[PDB]
Design an enzyme around this catalytic site. Structure first.
Site, mmCIF file in Angstrom:
data_model
loop_
_atom_site.group_PDB
_atom_site.id
_atom_site.type_symbol
_atom_site.label_atom_id
_atom_site.label_comp_id
_atom_site.label_asym_id
_atom_site.label_seq_id
_atom_site.Cartn_x
_atom_site.Cartn_y
_atom_site.Cartn_z
ATOM 1 C CD1 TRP A 83 -1.695 -2.197 2.258
ATOM 2 C CD2 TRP A 83 -2.903 -1.570 0.474
ATOM 3 N NE1 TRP A 83 -2.653 -3.164 2.035
ATOM 4 C CE2 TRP A 83 -3.404 -2.805 0.945
ATOM 5 C CE3 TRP A 83 -3.510 -0.975 -0.639
ATOM 6 C CZ2 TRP A 83 -4.485 -3.457 0.339
ATOM 7 C CZ3 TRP A 83 -4.577 -1.628 -1.250
ATOM 8 C CH2 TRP A 83 -5.058 -2.855 -0.755
ATOM 9 N N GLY A 119 -7.887 6.034 3.324
ATOM 10 C CA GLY A 119 -8.357 6.919 4.389
ATOM 11 C C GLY A 119 -8.140 8.398 4.125
ATOM 12 C CE1 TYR A 130 -5.895 -0.172 -5.285
ATOM 13 C CE2 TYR A 130 -4.540 1.809 -5.305
ATOM 14 C CZ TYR A 130 -5.382 0.941 -4.640
ATOM 15 O OH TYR A 130 -5.710 1.195 -3.329
ATOM 16 C CD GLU A 199 -10.717 -0.718 -0.304
ATOM 17 O OE1 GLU A 199 -9.885 0.200 -0.455
ATOM 18 O OE2 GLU A 199 -10.818 -1.366 0.760
ATOM 19 C CB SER A 200 -11.184 2.127 1.704
ATOM 20 O OG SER A 200 -11.021 2.432 3.076
ATOM 21 C CD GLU A 325 -15.238 -4.133 4.908
ATOM 22 O OE1 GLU A 325 -14.240 -3.409 5.098
ATOM 23 O OE2 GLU A 325 -15.624 -4.434 3.756
ATOM 24 C CE1 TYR A 328 -3.834 -2.721 6.965
ATOM 25 C CE2 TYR A 328 -5.531 -1.064 7.294
ATOM 26 C CZ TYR A 328 -4.238 -1.406 6.931
ATOM 27 O OH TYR A 328 -3.357 -0.418 6.542
ATOM 28 C CD1 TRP A 430 -2.896 -8.597 5.221
ATOM 29 C CD2 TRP A 430 -2.260 -7.972 7.278
ATOM 30 N NE1 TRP A 430 -2.480 -7.287 5.152
ATOM 31 C CE2 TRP A 430 -2.078 -6.881 6.397
ATOM 32 C CE3 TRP A 430 -1.907 -7.818 8.617
ATOM 33 C CZ2 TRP A 430 -1.586 -5.649 6.821
ATOM 34 C CZ3 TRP A 430 -1.413 -6.588 9.037
ATOM 35 C CH2 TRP A 430 -1.265 -5.522 8.144
ATOM 36 C CG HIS A 438 -10.730 -2.215 4.685
ATOM 37 N ND1 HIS A 438 -12.044 -1.966 4.348
ATOM 38 C CD2 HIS A 438 -10.065 -1.051 4.485
ATOM 39 C CE1 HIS A 438 -12.167 -0.711 3.958
ATOM 40 N NE2 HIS A 438 -10.981 -0.133 4.030
HETATM 41 C C1 HUP Z 1 -5.814 -2.499 3.935
HETATM 42 C C2 HUP Z 1 -4.925 -1.360 3.609
HETATM 43 C C3 HUP Z 1 -5.426 -0.134 3.473
HETATM 44 C C4 HUP Z 1 -6.829 0.108 2.973
HETATM 45 C C5 HUP Z 1 -7.406 1.246 3.720
HETATM 46 C C6 HUP Z 1 -6.661 2.157 4.328
HETATM 47 C C7 HUP Z 1 -7.364 3.249 5.072
HETATM 48 C C8 HUP Z 1 -5.187 2.193 4.342
HETATM 49 C C9 HUP Z 1 -4.569 1.114 3.417
HETATM 50 N N1 HUP Z 1 -3.188 0.830 3.804
HETATM 51 C C10 HUP Z 1 -4.626 1.624 1.981
HETATM 52 C C11 HUP Z 1 -3.586 2.486 1.520
HETATM 53 C C12 HUP Z 1 -3.579 2.965 0.259
HETATM 54 C C13 HUP Z 1 -4.632 2.636 -0.685
HETATM 55 O O1 HUP Z 1 -4.705 3.022 -1.855
HETATM 56 N N2 HUP Z 1 -5.647 1.789 -0.178
HETATM 57 C C14 HUP Z 1 -5.640 1.293 1.112
HETATM 58 C C15 HUP Z 1 -6.782 0.399 1.466
#
Ligand code: HUP
Ligand SMILES: *[C@@H]1O[C@H](CO[C@@H]2O[C@@H](C)[C@@H](O)[C@@H](O)[C@@H]2O)[C@@H](O[C@@H]2O[C@H](CO)[C@@H](O)[C@H](O)[C@H]2NC(C)=O)[C@H](O)[C@H]1NC(C)=O
Ligand SMILES: *[C@@H]1O[C@H](CO[C@@H]2O[C@@H](C)[C@@H](O)[C@@H](O)[C@@H]2O)[C@@H](O[C@@H]2O[C@H](CO)[C@@H](O)[C@H](O)[C@H]2NC(C)=O)[C@H](O)[C@H]1NC(C)=O
Ligand code: HUP
Ligand code: NAG
Lengths: 530, 535
Positions: A83, A119, A130, A199-200, A325, A328, A430, A438
């Protein structure tokens, strides 16, 4: 010279790159500028359209990642690192990417627009998970994704002020959607068939475009994955945004909004990032410092208010959640939790955990949470306490806000499809107690399992192909269903039907955690108003 | 003259009667005066001990029923009229009954003392379902039951005043227990082994004797059937008792509202009994079910503090208690006011009727509190299903009024020194006249405990007669040893504790052990809801 990789857009000429997939080539245009660099005097301000350039912009590689915090909870761990920024950080980050079939479509092709969602403090269009190549090849759509400003750079707000009005990262998104309206045809895309998916925080972003009239004319269908604009984390009040912005200034040595923002503008980007987390009012999980603000402008009211008042006839929406959900988020501050053990917590940890996972509410509100989430025949069993706190964080933050959105939309004219994603990836790094966390449906939607260099099973590849087909079907027709042979029924406020997405065929079920969500959506608000 | 039927107690001589029972003869002394008649100037006053008498008092039939409201909801219907007075109404009602084996026990015999409980407004020791002959025959205990003042005559309170101090009905009960201490030996009873038992308001009464030190020395064990002193119907505050007393007086012309307490009570004393009764239900603050106008008052005297507080502060070491509920505590009450309910139809209610019933079944709480009840009792996958709604309202009334107060009591007692045994009664009598949807209603275990199915003139199945004998055995075993278990290979009844919360199912099948007295539901009523009412 390959003519398929040369495109002229309103701003000028671009050179793309041919990409390989197991099913054939794809054309990609990466790092296309859609705004002027929001630097110096332009920090915190709405984005300006990119001025035309001469020559040929090299669009063969991803551009810089918008300045953001870097997750260092578990250094070197795939689960968090996947991420993190995989290109250099910069405030010069407003670029977008277009993937198209090869050779380019000679007729109007439906467009999918991806909005990432860490977030509102993190994310990048360049993340491996992606990668648009597989969806575009398999389903023959045009795929667009953009970088938008996050953290303070995108969402710091001194409401009322002209120097930091808030929601600029959302305006970055809208600008990119305008860019799509004006330029996507040059790639074979059909600007009259644009489906947003996210997403999110990206899902919350999509929802916000639904409820903001200047954005509503820029797309036609919406997909919201594990996120909703009415989430308790997705917006912040004017007062609390002003306070957070003011504390950031103080923490970095700055003092009138004009003078305050001016001083913030002199600070290196990294310095702002270094103090981002410090402006939260209390210890928490699933809470972020700089998020969209309800100011009367981009959002003329709270998302809840805008949702209840809305006429949604003519709208099709796809919404859904993963099986677990909350898991994480627990490792970022819930006492007793870690990816490195079973996280079998004690009752006392559970109780302290509730205040972390449901921050800023009264003792009475907390007690009510503990009542509904305790099994009073087994009040102290560690496994059940672990599962329950995960349920609290997941329901409060994701499942129930999504259920509420879905119910209101369905009851007010929209056709809604709902899913629960229940497959745990064979490659998931994980621990097993986290279940399906999530963010872990995304790699399946993007068909990452088709990447030969990765270790997914044959079953998993087929499953990814099913999901890409549902998503692309929805983008094309507003209905994920394939020709009859088990059907995915629309979600309604009464029947509350949704499907499970896993290796097994579609199974239809009822109620998105209806018992738990009655609490969060119907009762808890009444309590807090008294 | 038969020597078995003659007995001398502190007050004078008594003549009793020999009763036939299916398993042999029993001596019965029915209608023994234990107090001076609370007549005229003595209305609302604590009972005075019965003056000694010369000659022989015939204790050969039940005395009058204490003046009380008569249930007219379903005239002619057995299910309601079985609870109605079966002797003439009179304020001259302070009489108790003693049943003893024939011939009279040679060595001191354990004593069961029954307390009826029609909501502190009705009941009498003479009811057919309280016939003590079968218990005494089967198990060779001594059985005592007493009449006590109910309604205004027992519980009208103008707190602080000498003329109507409240709780005189409970004082009637205590005087009877004092009588048992002084006199039960003369019938072959053991004053050092006295077990109180009661159902509904009787159960709540038993609980109050547990929490009131002058009563506490008069018995050794307790049995609370479908009631608890901490129930929301079982006590009332000083101010609300005063308001109710005052409105009653006002409704019957006293004084010619409030004023001198002495003067107001003197005026109430001149009103015919039936005049007071005619206005009893009118003093309740709202339309409700399972609420009663005149009930024990937290006076700082009989009850030094609320029963909740007393239970919590209590040391209960050396105490054995047997507690329980029926399967459908709430159903009986719903036909007395919940919209949509009747014994004469399926009572398949609408959602709107459910919501309205919630305010009837949980009267005088905030809208927020009501919303909380709706939240926990609605199935959000079937929010409008009539059958589910009927069952849900039943559970609301039963949980709120009976199951949860009993569970709270049981849990606190166990954690604070007492050995507690808990049951759920799940047999629906073959002769039940109430409709099938009501399941096993409030009050319908009593007939089995008293062994009524052994009565030849009645039409119980043979299995039910076996069942009744089983229950009588548990009750008497508990009376004798403090433990309902048989003092072999038969399944054991384990103690109830705050942690494991184990209880047994009482029905035609053998004992089955289970956990939790509606635990999820009762956490709402006992742990959460009170925090909401404060804040
Ligand atoms: C499960 C990991 C996550 C998810 C939600 C958040 C809020 C932070 C995260 N590291 C993250 C960081 C960057 C992103 O693009 N999506 C996500 C999805
Ligand atoms: C599971 O781990 C948590 C998290 O602690 C960290 O991770 C462990 C794998 C190990 O490396 C610990 O030393 C790490 O601190 C444990 O919770 C912590 O416990 C320590 C004492 O050992 C305490 O000082 C911290 O406050 C705790 N941290 C948190 C997140 O509350 C927990 O004890 C472990 N649970 C078990 C043993 O099952
Ligand atoms: C079930 O009965 C209730 C109570 O009504 C009484 O009992 C019935 C068996 C029948 O004999 C009625 O005539 C009795 O009045 C019904 O609720 C009543 O409905 C009427 C209007 O229809 C109203 O005037 C009363 O106030 C209602 N009483 C209460 C307590 O709500 C109910 O409708 C019946 N359910 C059915 C038939 O489905
Ligand atoms: C189920 C019938 C009942 C129960 C509770 C009450 C409150 C009234 C009732 N009619 C009643 C009347 C007189 C009595 O002694 N007991 C009972 C028990
Ligand atoms: C109430 O009235 C009576 C009747 O005369 C009187 O004797 C008594 O003292 C009065 N009590 C009070 C407190 O006024």
């Amino acid at each position: 010279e390959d003519a398929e990789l040369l495109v002229t857009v309103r701003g000028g000429r671009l050179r793309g790159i041919r990409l390989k997939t197991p099913g054939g080539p794809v054309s990609a245009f990466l790092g296309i500028p859609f705004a002027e660099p929001p630097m110096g005097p332009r920090r915190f301000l709405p984005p300006e359209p990119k001025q035309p350039w001469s020559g040929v912009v090299d669009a063969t590689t991803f551009q810089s990642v918008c300045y953001q915090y870097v997750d260092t909870l578990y250094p070197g761990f795939e689960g968090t690192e996947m991420w993190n920024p995989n290109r250099e950080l910069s405030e010069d980050c407003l670029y977008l990417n277009v993937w198209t079939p090869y050779p380019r479509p000679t007729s109007p092709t439906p467009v999918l627009v991806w909005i990432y969602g860490g977030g509102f403090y993190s994310g990048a269009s360049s993340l491996d998970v992606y990668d648009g190549r597989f969806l575009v090849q398999a389903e023959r759509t045009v795929l667009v994704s953009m970088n938008y400003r996050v953290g303070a750079f995108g969402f710091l707000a001194l409401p009322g002020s002209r120097e930091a009005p808030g929601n600029v990262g959302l305006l970055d998104q809208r600008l990119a959607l305008q860019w799509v309206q004006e330029n996507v045809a040059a790639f074979g895309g059909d600007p009259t068939s644009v489906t947003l998916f996210g997403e999110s925080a990206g899902a919350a972003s999509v929802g916000m475009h639904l409820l903001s009239p200047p954005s509503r004319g820029l797309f036609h269908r919406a997909v919201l994955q594990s996120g909703a604009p009415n989430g308790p984390w997705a917006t912040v009040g004017m007062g609390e945004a002003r306070r957070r912005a003011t504390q950031l200034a103080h923490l970095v040595g700055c003092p009138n909004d004009t003078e305050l923002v001016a001083c913030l503008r002199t600070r290196p980007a990294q310095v702002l990032v270094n103090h981002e987390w410090h402006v939260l009012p209390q210890e928490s999980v699933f809470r972020f410092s700089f998020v969209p603000v309800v100011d009367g402008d981009f959002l003329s009211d709270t998302p809840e208010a805008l949702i209840n008042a809305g006429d949604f006839h003519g709208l099709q929406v796809l919404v859904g959640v993963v099986k677990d959900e909350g898991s994480y988020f627990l490792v970022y501050g819930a006492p007793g939790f870690s990816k490195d053990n079973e996280s079998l917590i004690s009752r006392a940890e559970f109780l302290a955990g509730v205040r972390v996972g449901v921050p800023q509410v009264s003792d009475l509100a907390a007690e009510a949470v503990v009542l509904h989430y305790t099994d009073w025949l087994h009040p102290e069993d560690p496994a059940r306490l672990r599962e329950a706190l995960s349920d609290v964080v997941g329901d409060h933050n994701v499942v129930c806000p999504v259920a509420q959105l879905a119910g209101r939309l369905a009851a007010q004219g929209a056709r809604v499809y709902a899913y629960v994603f229940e497959h745990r990836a064979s490659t998931l790094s994980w621990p097993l107690w986290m279940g399906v966390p999530h963010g872990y449906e995304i790699e399946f939607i993007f068909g990452i399992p088709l990447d030969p260099s990765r270790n997914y099973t044959a079953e998993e590849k087929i499953f990814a192909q099913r999901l890409m087909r549902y998503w692309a079907n929805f983008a094309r027709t507003g209905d994920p269903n394939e020709p009859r042979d088990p059907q995915w029924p629309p979600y309604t406020a009464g029947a509350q039907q949704y499907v499970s997405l896993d290796l097994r065929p579609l199974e239809v079920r009822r109620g998105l955690r209806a018992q738990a969500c009655a609490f969060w959506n119907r009762f808890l608000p009444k309590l807090l108003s008294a």
